[PDB]
């Protein structure tokens with residue numbers, strides 16, 4: 001479980017927000033892209049796996065699951081690509097709740113920046129630092145550190 | 150020291166590679182940009198600080214140190230912006246050595262991808278996973294986890 005991530009794609013202002021969630025911690029990374037393509041998804045996964053020890057990725061849909069470019073990136077980066085089918089049905093709802101929360105945070109900061117991408121990164125910051133008392137950022141580090149020992 | 154990062158800017162193929170180094174671990178994040186502007190640097194720091202607990206950044210030059218946009222981002226993200234003057238003169242050399250090593254890794258992967266940005270992210274991956282035996286990725290997590298506890 002310390003190496004497990006979930007991809008998630010949501011839409012705002014006619015653009016796409018691509019999100020990777022560390023399942024055990026709730027920590028996220030995100031980017032704005034014009035549209036979800038295999039190439040964009042593959043590049044996003046390469047960035048993620050260079051930054052955190054990504055063992056398994058639950059892909060967000062069948063097109064990315066199928067994409068040869070995504071498969072090439074997962075091979076390159078040593079990532080096991082899996083489906084993201086909510087076998088535990090509470091998964092649909094958890095992701096849905098996350099997307100709603102992210103968009104809410106984006107709305108709270110939206111006026112501080114001109115570009116959506118800036119507002120998205122502010123929202124990533126706010127989410128990962130929020131005290132729930134540990135934050136997601138603290139949890140991911142502790143989880144992986146425990147795993148290393 | 151767990152919160153201390155150093156910015157570094159290097160050039161390749163007529164483009165700019167912006168690098169943030171976690172001083173205590175040697176862990177890096179990097180991006181390709183057309184040119185090093187305050188706005189690009191500010192955005193890069195926002196991304197970094199949303200992902201890792203950035204307390205202090207040693208800026209790479211006086212223009213970024215002075216930039217109002219960089220100062221605004223450091224304020225927003227709770228980052229103490231400092232100079233990057235090598236008071237310990239081995240700093241010039243360590244950064245120089247890093248840039249040389251990065252470019253070498255980029256050269257080793259360059260043919261596998263068309264875009265420089267992809268090759269840079271492959272090099273980030275290879276650097277952060279390389280066993281020196283701990284890797285930089287392992288060191289940064291351990292350092293921050295120890296700090297949390």
Ligand SMILES: O=C1C(=O)N(Cc2ccc3c(c2C(=O)O)OCCO3)c2ccc(Br)cc21
Pocket residue numbers: 021022023024025026027028094097098099101102105127136
């Ligand atoms: O509300 C949520 C949520 O459920 N998560 C996802 C999540 C998944 C699994 C978890 C989570 C979270 C989380 O609450 O961040 O927390 C404990 C560990 O298990 C979010 C992530 C980003 C943003 Br913005 C909002 C949320």
Ligand SMILES: O=C1C(=O)N(Cc2ccc3c(c2C(=O)O)OCCO3)c2ccc(Br)cc21
Pocket residue numbers: 112113114115118188191192195218221222223225226
């Ligand atoms: O609020 C802004 C902002 O406007 N940007 C920078 C910026 C400066 C000038 C611009 C900008 C932006 C931007 O929103 O990226 O958009 C194009 C118009 O001119 C930020 C970067 C980091 C952080 Br934290 C906050 C912000």
Ligand SMILES: O=C1C(=O)N(Cc2ccc3c(c2C(=O)O)OCCO3)c2ccc(Br)cc21
Pocket residue numbers: 170171172173174175176177243244246247248250251254276285
């Ligand atoms: O050769 C180096 C180097 O010195 N570092 C920077 C660095 C700074 C301080 C350290 C470092 C490193 C490092 O070797 O990564 O290692 C142990 C902790 O103290 C590099 C970072 C990325 C890449 Br690519 C190459 C290098």
Ligand SMILES: O=C1C(=O)N(Cc2ccc3c(c2C(=O)O)OCCO3)c2ccc(Br)cc21
Pocket residue numbers: 039042043046069072073074076077261262263264267
């Ligand atoms: O080697 C490539 C590659 O070509 N890309 C993706 C890619 C696919 C098709 C392209 C690409 C790229 C790319 O280099 O980003 O460049 C534009 C021409 O058509 C990679 C993405 C992740 C990883 Br890991 C490796 C690679």
